[PDB]
Design a protein around this ligand. Structure first.
Ligand SMILES: CC(C)c1ccc(/N=N/c2ccc(O)cc2)cc1
Length: 124
């Protein structure tokens, strides 16, 4: 329901590093506030960067392994993670930015308590 305030600082840092790396503008990313995953190429590569920085990208295929966080996390995220990994961890495309885009698109439709991450990264 509300992401602990302690995740804000690293997410803001993650957001700034990934904007610089992908070349995505804040204007492009803001579309997630309406519950729609941004479709711009730089915005798709921003999503890939986020997952790459938290080391959840299968370094070889581009596959998102949201299960990996279950080791680096102190709170009740198991049921929320296990559902997203059940519904969305099959997504693989020849483009890492496209795989990251399609996976988040699946996350948003699946168990979207949870555009709250768009709020976490994009505006607070
Ligand atoms: C498109 C951008 C701005 C974006 C939108 C939502 C995001 N959500 N990241 C999550 C990662 C793991 C979870 O269990 C839940 C959410 C990440 C990036």
């Amino acid at each position: 329901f509300e992401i602990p305030d302690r995740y804000k600082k690293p997410a803001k840092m993650l957001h700034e590093i990934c904007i610089a790396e992908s070349g995505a503008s804040e204007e492009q990313l803001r579309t997630c506030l309406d519950g729609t995953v941004p479709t711009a190429p730089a915005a798709k590569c921003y999503i890939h960067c986020l997952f790459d920085k938290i080391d959840v990208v299968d370094e070889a295929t581009g596959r998102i392994l949201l299960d990996r966080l279950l080791y680096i996390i102190p709170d009740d995220v198991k049921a929320a993670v296990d559902h997203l990994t059940r519904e969305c961890s099959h997504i693989v495309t020849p483009d890492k930015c496209e795989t990251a885009y399609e996976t988040v698109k699946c996350y948003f439709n699946a168990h979207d308590e949870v555009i709250k991450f768009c709020h976490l990264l994009v505006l607070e």
